[PDB]
Design a protein around this nucleic acid. Structure first.
Lengths: 96, 64
RNA sequence: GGGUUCUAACUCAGGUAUAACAAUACCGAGGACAAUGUAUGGUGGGUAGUUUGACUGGGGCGGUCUCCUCCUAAAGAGUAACGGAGGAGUACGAAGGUGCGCUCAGAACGGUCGGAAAUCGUUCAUAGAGUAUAAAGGCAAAAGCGCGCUUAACUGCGAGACCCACAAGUCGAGCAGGUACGAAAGUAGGUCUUAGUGAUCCGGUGGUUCUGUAUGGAAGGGCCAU
RNA sequence: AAUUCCUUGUCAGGUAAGUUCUGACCUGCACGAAUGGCAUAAUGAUGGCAGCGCUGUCUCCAGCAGAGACUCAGUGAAAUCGAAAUCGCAGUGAAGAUGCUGUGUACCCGCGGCUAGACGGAAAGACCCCGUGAACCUUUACUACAGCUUUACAUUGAAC
RNA sequence: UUUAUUAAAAACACAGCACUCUGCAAACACGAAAGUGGACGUAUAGGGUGUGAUGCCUGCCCGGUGCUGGAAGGUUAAUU
RNA sequence: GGCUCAAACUAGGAGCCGAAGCUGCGGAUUUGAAACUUGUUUUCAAGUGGUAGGGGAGCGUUGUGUAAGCCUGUGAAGGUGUGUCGUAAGGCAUGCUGGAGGUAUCACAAGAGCGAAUGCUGACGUGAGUAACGAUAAUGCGAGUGAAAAGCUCGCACGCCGGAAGAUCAAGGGUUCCAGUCCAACGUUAAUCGGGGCUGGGUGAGUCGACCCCUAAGGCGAGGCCGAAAGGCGUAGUCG
RNA sequence: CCACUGUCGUUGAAAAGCCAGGGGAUGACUUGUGGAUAGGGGUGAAAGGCUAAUCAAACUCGGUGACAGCUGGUUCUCCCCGAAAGCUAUUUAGGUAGCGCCUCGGACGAAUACCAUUGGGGGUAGAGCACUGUUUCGGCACCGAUGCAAACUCCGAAUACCGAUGAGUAAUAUCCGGGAGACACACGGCGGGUGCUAACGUCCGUCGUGGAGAGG
RNA sequence: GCUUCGGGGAGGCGGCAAUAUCCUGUGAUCCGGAGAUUUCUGAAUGGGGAAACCCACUUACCAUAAGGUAGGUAUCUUGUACAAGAAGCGAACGAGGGGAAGUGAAACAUCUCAGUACCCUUAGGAAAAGACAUCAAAUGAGAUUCCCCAAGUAGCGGCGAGCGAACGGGGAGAAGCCGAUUAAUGCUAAUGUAGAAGAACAGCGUGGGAAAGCUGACCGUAGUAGGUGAUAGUCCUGUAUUCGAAACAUUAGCGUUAACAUAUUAAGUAGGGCGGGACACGAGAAAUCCUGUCUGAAGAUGGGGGGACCAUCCUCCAAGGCUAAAUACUCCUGACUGACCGAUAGUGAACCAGUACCGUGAGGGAAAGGCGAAAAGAACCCCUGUGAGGGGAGUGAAAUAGAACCUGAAACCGUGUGCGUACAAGCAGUAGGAGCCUCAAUUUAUUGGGGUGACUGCGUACCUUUUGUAUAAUGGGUCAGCGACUUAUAUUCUGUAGCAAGGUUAACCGUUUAGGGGAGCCGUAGGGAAACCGAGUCUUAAUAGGGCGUCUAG
C-alpha cells in the first residue's frame, strides 16, 4: 500500500491540509426518520441517548430534514435546521 | 486484536466525499512569484482523486 | 579583579608499630593542587555502523541524465538509438497596457572633411531587414519602429476544449468588481509564440476568526498569500 | 639493472650459430644514499650463465629381473546413470547430431587393448557481469563511540 | 625463522645503527576498577619506530602533513 | 535414383493427386433464440487450437453427523486379475489372495491428490562378478587333527629382523592375559586358527609404584580490595 | 628434529604418505609431564600464519522459520474465454506501479466495425530549383544551358487520419466494479536511422506469423 | 526388603523368563496409612580432591594391641564462647538489575525490530498494583487489577517505514484499614489416601471358535464401556445405585501459645538548572513521572494537579506502612474430552532413548512395534559337519500363520510355457498387418476373446527456462513412503440466507449452542480546514459563476 515503484507516491506528492476538530466528534446529527425510536414526546440529548440514536459521549445534537416525523415532539437542547423545524411544526411539534 | 492500520500520512492528504476523495493540489507551497496568477488561482482549492488513484487511496485509508 | 603563604579536606605505589596484605595510629612529604563525578569544547580509523547511482552493442574509463528548436518521424498526433545539428537554467516597470503615428535591408546617382562603408538628398526595393535571445513556425491590421498617457505584469472566477498513467501542463470566450488608454466601438488578466525550471516534508514571513485540552486568554495548529 | 617501455638498445666477449650470460657505453619511459647507496671475504637444498667429468636425457631404443596387468579359485567396491533396438558421411537444426533429412555401410555376442567423440565424470564457474547481496581491510567518505585533553560546578578550606 | 596441507625465498628474524619517548605511582601494555606486567628494573635502563654484519659512506628541500616550542592578535563550549 | 524431341526451360490447355481447410455421416459441448418449461422436451443459429491468466462444473481420499443404521467369517479393509460403465478425474461387478473390519445417501471439515525441487527416508539396480584383497622378509614338504587344511599344531628345511620386527616400562587402553570349547557373524580368502563367541581361571609387596610428607609453575583463596548483578583480584593459608 | 628435488600414489597403505636423494644435528636445539593466554579475543623470528582435519574473525546453542526484487519446485479432472513482452515513472533497467492488452459481473443498446457517396487539413513518395546551399559548361556576381540535398521547396499524390449521410452484414462500441497476467520478445515483408543498402546485427514505425498454433 | 495398623481372601516369591528351593486359612502374595533401616558421592558441611576417593582431629565407652561403637568438628547471618536460621536443586507464570542484532524502512544513520532474545537477582501460590497531593469539566465521579468497546480514532513520526493512546461506556470482581503478618498446639466438621455389594439368556442351524443368523425370553436409576476363539444390556471385568477408615495428610471454624510488627501525618522533600530516561508523545509550543549531577521551598493565611504559560474555578493533600477478589501459569495430581496422530505419523524417544553413535568439550543425536484365540513354538524320523537349511510326521481353523513369523505392493532378481529374434541402422511407439500358438462357441478352421508381431507408413523423451530446445541447456539411477498457497484477525467485493429503514449485539451472565446482556458498530446526508450550516453547503463583495452533494437498501 502506497508504493509506486520508487516514484514519489501520490500521498507524498500531495500536501497535507486541514486540522481535526474535537467539537465535531461530540456533535451528532439526528434525522427526522430516526425519531420513532424515542420513547415519549420530549426530544432532548438525554432522550436521544436513551433511544440509542446518538452515542452516550455526544454532548450536543442537530436535527436535520432527512425523513419525516409522524407525531408531535418537544425539542429542548438540540439545534434544528430550517426544513426540519418547519416539518416539526407542520407535524405539530415545538422547539425550545 | 489485530486490525488493518491506516497509512496516517495518506489520511492527512485525503478526505472522504460522497462518491470519492478530495485533495489539495501540488505546486503551491513555495517559489510562487514566477507563477502566473491563473496558475496561482487554479492550483488553489480541492480536486478529486483520480479514479486510477482511487483503489490505492482505498487501500491506504481503509476506514475514513 | 592574580599571585604568595598556611593546613585542616584530600593524596602517598614513604618510614615506625600493628605476624602478612590491607586498614588504622603517629611521623614525614605533598596540598586546595592532584584525583574523581556531572557538564562542556577539542582531538580521535583506536573501534563500530554504513554509504560509495543509473544508462551503456559486457563492464570499467569517458560521455550523458531536466527543459526548448530542427531532422530522423513513413503529408493528423505520437514514435527509438552512446542517431545528425543547435540552444536554455534568463531578460524587461518597459522591452508590459492603450491611443496615435511610421516602415526595413541593400544597390545606384549627387554631395566638405568622408573612404568600400558615417550623416544628407534622389530613384528602385513584400522584407533580400527587424523581431532581447537558439531554431522553427509566424509577422503589413505589422507580432517590426517611434511618441503621449499609464499599471490589466488587476482581484474573484470561469462555459468549453487541448494534452495527459497520475501528479502536472496548455488555451479560453464570458460574468462581477476596481482601473488604464481612447472621441468612441473598444482594447488590456504581461511580453510574436514555443525554453528560462523543482513535488512533498520542514521551517520563516505578511494576513485571517477558523480552532484554542476545566473556563477566559495565550501558546500551538488550520485557512489565504509568500 | 630483481628498476629500461621502445628493446633482442649499441659496442666487445663467449658459440658454427647466444631474445639468456659477462664487460662496457649512458639516450636513467621510471636508480640514488637508513621505505638506506655502492661494494664486500664467508655462508645459502637462493636466481642467471658457462665448463670438466659423467652418463639411456637424447640419436633410438634393445635385452633382462621383480611387482601388477592376463587366466583360474575365493571374497567383492567406485563414481555415474531419463530411457535405449546407442554406426559413417554430407546437410539440417537453439547455430559443432548415435537419434532429424538424404545417403553409405553394417550377421548376433564376448575378451585384451585404446582414448578421437559421447560439448565424457567430478564441483549450482573462482573469470566476467548482475543483486539498492556478504564480509574483512583502508582513508583528509559520513555518523558515532572508547581513549586522551580543555574549562565550569562539586568533593573544596584559611590568611595576606 | 616462515605460508601444518601447492610458495623456504631475495620474505621474517638477526647482532649492529639511528631517531624519539620515559625522572619512576616511568613511559607503555592488560583490566570496568581493584590488581598486574614493565621491574623487586631506574636514562650505560625501559618502550615505540625505522634500518639491518662489515668497508666506504649517507647530498638538497621545513612549501604540504605530522611532531616540538611560543602566544601578540582573531575565532571559540558549557556557563552566567 | 536417374533425366536431354526431358523427368530442363518459355507459352498455353486438359485431367488428376494433394491438408486436422470444405462437404458427407454419426456423436458431444458453449452461447443465444419460439414454446408442457429450471436438462421436459424437439429443434434452430453461431461457435468449441491455446501459454500466462480469468471464469465455470465435477471426481477421488481421510474424518464427523446421518449410523445402536446398512454390509460383513456364507469373508471387511488391503493386495492382485478380469469384465463392464462414464467426456474425464473415476464408478461398479466379480475370480484369486486376505482374515476383521467397512461404509450407502446427503451435508460438513480437510495433514485432500506428486515425476521432477543436485527434495527427505528406506529398499534395490547399473558399473561388474569388474578394481582391489594394504609394504616384493618367502616359502617347501612330511605327519596330526578335522566335514573339509596353502594359512592351525608338531617336525625338518628355507627366508626376515636383530639400536629390532628382541626385552622393561610410562602414557593410553581395559581383560585384549591363560585354558577349555565353538566357527554363524567378525578376520578383506579358507580356517580345525584368532586380539571373534561362550564358559572357567588369573594380578599376592614394610623395601616396586601410588597414597603419604614437601614444595615449582599455576589454581582456590577466613578476612581485605574492586565491581550494576553475575563476578574480578588478592593476604594469611590451602592445593598442585 | 625438519622438509629442498624427483618419481610414485591422487576412488591412496595415507583427508598430505612412501621411496631415492636433501638440511640442521651443543643450539635462537629437540623432546616428556603439568600449567597460562579465548574470539574482534589470543598468539604470531609476520605467512593473515595458527587458535582440535574448521580461520580476513573458532566452535556450540540461542535470536532463528534472519532476509533472499534471486534460482528451483509447486501434486485430481473436464468445459468457456484468452493476453503481453508496449507507454509513462522509478538508486530504474531481469523488480515494481498507473495506463494499454486478458477475464468475470453489471449497466447501456447500435452510440461500434466494414463499404458507397461526401466535408476537411496536410508537406511524405515523386518531382523541382522559386529560397538556403551545393555543382558543371558557355557568355560576360549577372545571362543562358545543366545536375544534386534529412536538418532545401515554386510544387505535390496514393494511402492514412478526423467528420457527415446511407444500405446491408456482424457474438459491436462505451461505462462501473471483482480477478489477473505482462512490462527479455523473435523472425519475415514494407518505410527509415545506424552499420558496410554486412550480420540469424542494432534502433524505431507498420503488417503477418511464432510466442500461445497442431495439419499440408 | 523389616515392624505395625487397616483392607482383602487363595494363591504367591517384580520384568525379560523360566527353573529350583519353598511360602501361604496360625491369612501369604497384593493394596493403603504410619514407622524402622537408609552404603558412598553430590549444597556436601572436619581438611583436601581427578565426584562416588585420600587424610584427619576430638568426646565418652569398650578392647589390648595397631582397633571397634555412639557422637562432635564447614561457612555466613541474627541473638546472648552459646542457641536459631540459611546454603543447593527444580516447569512456567511475577517483580526487579542490565540489554542486542538479523530484520523493516524496497539502500541507510533518526526510527523499526524491542525493552524482544539473552544474561543476572529474587519471590509467591500467584506476584505486582492499590484507596487519590486520581480523573472529570457532565446532570460530575470515586482505590487497584482484568475483559469488550471507545479505535487503528486523537496524536507521535527521516510526518517515511511505522508507532499508537486517553476520556468515557458495558462487564468480572468489589474493601478498605493501622498487624487484613508468620509459625505451632488442641478440639469440631468436611475431604483425600486402600476398599464392598451390584440385575437380567435359553434353544436351534452355521462355524475352528458365536457375541453374528432364526425362534422365543428377561433386567434396566444398569443399553453405544473394555474384554472373551467373529459383532454380548443378561459370559467376565464393569456400569446405575448404595456404601466403609485403625492411621496419617489437607481444607475450613473456635480457642490457646510465641516471634515479629504496631507510622501519626512526614525536607535535602516538592520545585529548579544541566544530561538522560519514561510516558502513544522521536524537544517538539511539551504538560506529567524517574533521576546521574548542581541546587533547593512553602509548610494549611499552605501546597499538588487540571498537557507551554497566566488568571479564575474545580479537585486532591506527596515526602509513613499495609490490603482479599476478579488476572498470569503448568514440572505436576484426579476426572473427563477430542470431525487430533496411528509406527517415515504422533514426543527425539510405542521397542532397555536422550540410548547407540558422533564430538576434547559445550553439544548434536538415530534406527528399531504386530506368530497364533491359546505356545498347542513342531516329540520322532531323514539328508547334512551332532552346523545351517530343509523334507516328512505332528499342532493348529490356517504353517507361502514356523518364530527375520498378520497382510505382503513396487522397484530389483530368477525358473517355466507360447510366439518373435543372428542381412539389419536411430525416443523403441503408433496405424496397419502375414504367420504361428491358445481358449469358446460352431457341425467343424468359421468366427470371437487372449499371447506374439515378420513386413509397411509415420514418428528426435519428459520437466524447466526461454525469442527459440531432440538439443550437445537444467533436473531426475529406479521404486515405495513423505514433501509446497495454511492459520488468526482486519478489510473490500460477490453469492446465499434472515431481518429490513433498519440490521446486529460484544465482553459477560447463564442449569452454557437456549435465554439474557444495546455498551458499541454499520446504514439512514452532505458541504466545509474549521467554526458553522444542512438538501444543501463551500469559495466570493456577489443571491453571479463554479466545486462537491441531492435526484434510496441496508
Amino acid at each position: 500500500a502506497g508504493f509506486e515503484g520508487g516514484q514519489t507516491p501520490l500521498y507524498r506528492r500531495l500536501p497535507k491540509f486541514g486540522f481535526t476538530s474535537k467539537m465535531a466528534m461530540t456533535t451528532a446529527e439526528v434525522r427526522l426518520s430516526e425519531l420513532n425510536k424515542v420513547e415519549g414526546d420530549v426530544i432532548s440529548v438525554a432522550t436521544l441517548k436513551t433511544a440509542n440514536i446518538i452515542r452516550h459521549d455526544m454532548k450536543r445534537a442537530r436535527i436535520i430534514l432527512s425523513g419525516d416525523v409522524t407525531k408531535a415532539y418537544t425539542f429542548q437542547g438540540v439545534k434544528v435546521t430550517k426544513g426540519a423545524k418547519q416539518a416539526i411544526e407542520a407535524a405539530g411539534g415545538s422547539i425550545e | 486484536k489485530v486490525k488493518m492500520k491506516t497509512k496516517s500520512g495518506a489520511a492527512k492528504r485525503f478526505k472522504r466525499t460522497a462518491n470519492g476523495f478530495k485533495r489539495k493540489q501540488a505546486f503551491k507551497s513555495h517559489i510562487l512569484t514566477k507563477k502566473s496568477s491563473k496558475r496561482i488561482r487554479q492550483l488553489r482549492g480541492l480536486k478529486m482523486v483520480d479514479k486510477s488513484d482511487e483503489a490505492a487511496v482505498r487501500r491506504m485509508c481503509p476506514y475514513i
